[PDB]
Design a binder for this molecule. Sequence first.
Ligand SMILES: *[C@@H]1O[C@H](CO)[C@@H](O)[C@H](O)[C@H]1NC(C)=O
Lengths: 52, 53
Amino acid sequence: VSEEEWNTGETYTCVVAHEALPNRVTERTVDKSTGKPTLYNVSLVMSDTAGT
Amino acid sequence: ICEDDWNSGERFTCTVTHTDLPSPLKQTISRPKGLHRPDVYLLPPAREQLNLR
Ligand SMILES: *[C@@H]1O[C@H](CO)[C@@H](O)[C@H](O)[C@H]1NC(C)=O
């Protein structure tokens, strides 16, 4: 793939078919922010800690 | 009437003499005796009240 495709990376999938799979097809997805990411940008909000 | 007179508990009577019935009407009012100290608890609102808004 081209480097500008990896920049603002799209979802690239690996779909393989074999006899031994449960549903006979499996899928793995990688992009810039999943496969060996440089940074882990996460926003973690908790609301109503008192509960009900 | 003054306060300590009411706390003492003296009997008080009202005289009622209405026109058609010359017979007066008499009643007795007195303060009974008997004292436990109240305990005051102020319950905060439930967290569900804060949830509803
Ligand atoms: C990182 O996360 C913050 C907060 O969610 C967001 O404002 C920012 O745009 C994100 N940056 C990238 C490069 O995803």
